[PDB]
């Protein structure tokens, strides 16, 4: 379960690599880029990026073999979340990834993000029977949507 991350010019690399029983090693590589909007509080944007990385690591860890098969066209990534920089409030994150072959992967989770420290994964689970937008009204929060396209390739 080796991981590695690189960043340059607001572009990032995320890698997951595992040894095979065949005596060979193959790694999964993805890359994507993000923008920082000067009129939007950087503290929330910082948390969003870190959350994106954490959620992608979890998906890659669970479905490594499927992603080995998917050496090909860039995957579409969609994230919808309610994220605040306040330790007294739980954040909710939902991640969806769409394959070129039509396969869809989904995750959801909850996080706590202290403004000065790496985000903490929590034991609590997202409620699948309730629309997130409803939750945003009940506990006031801006709904944040973002999309990435990432290049999934495997080592040859």
């Amino acid at each position: 379960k080796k991981f590695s991350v690189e960043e340059e010019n607001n572009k990032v690399t995320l890698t997951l690599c595992k040894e095979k029983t065949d005596g060979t090693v193959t790694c999964l590589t993805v890359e994507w880029e993000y923008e920082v909007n000067p009129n939007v509080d950087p503290n929330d944007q910082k948390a969003f990026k870190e959350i994106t990385i954490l959620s992608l690591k979890e998906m890659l860890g669970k479905n490594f073999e499927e992603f080995v098969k998917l050496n090909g066209k860039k995957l579409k990534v969609s994230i919808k979340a309610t994220i605040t920089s306040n330790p007294n409030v739980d954040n909710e994150v939902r991640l969806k990834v769409k394959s070129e072959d039509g396969k869809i992967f989904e995750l959801c989770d909850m996080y706590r993000c202290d403004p000065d420290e790496p985000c903490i994964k929590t034991p609590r689970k997202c409620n699948p029977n309730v629309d997130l937008e409803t939750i945003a009204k009940r506990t006031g929060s801006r709904v944040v949507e973002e999309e990435f396209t990432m290049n999934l390739k495997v080592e040859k």
Partner: antibody
Amino acid sequence: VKLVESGGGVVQPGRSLRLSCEASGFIFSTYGMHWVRQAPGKGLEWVAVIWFDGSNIYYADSVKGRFTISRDNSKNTVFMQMDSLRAEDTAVYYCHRNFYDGSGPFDYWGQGTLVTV
Amino acid sequence: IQMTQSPSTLSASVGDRVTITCRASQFISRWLAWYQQKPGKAPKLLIYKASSLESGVPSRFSGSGSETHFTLTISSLQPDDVATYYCQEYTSYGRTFGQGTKVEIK
């Protein structure tokens, strides 16, 4: 939070005019401010942006070089100094502020004065 | 930069559904907002990121769009919805407004 303008009134073509925004409800240190014009019968036109301390002072290209923008020291206000005014510059000016965070939007549109050339 | 809108002036009956449009010259990554103005008054924010309704605004107001093309919809006009509407880009330190559209009743 309220924003108001100083200056304005009728001026002759080719004359200079100084305008300013005033604010008392906040300290102008965390996000930038904008100048917006509305010529009668026309929609809103963005003119310039200013940021706290060192600044990104981008001006609309259509009017560039005829005027400058600057923040005063304390006394929260923003100044804009125009020159070589033309009849086309007749407009109502507005103060504008805009930023976002997880709690949602802040706009605070002001009430400005009429400028006629 | 060069935002445009196609509806120009619209005319409608009370309760009619109304839709207006906006188009970017380039991809703007869904950094778009809408403003409402009535004569004699300062303009105010209506919708931000072209996807989320501002607080205190009745639910009949909504909007959505792609990185290059957007729409705004009022599900049913009320007498109080008469206004000039503007499309704005949020991609940088600077900002631009497109040519606005107007909605009038009869």
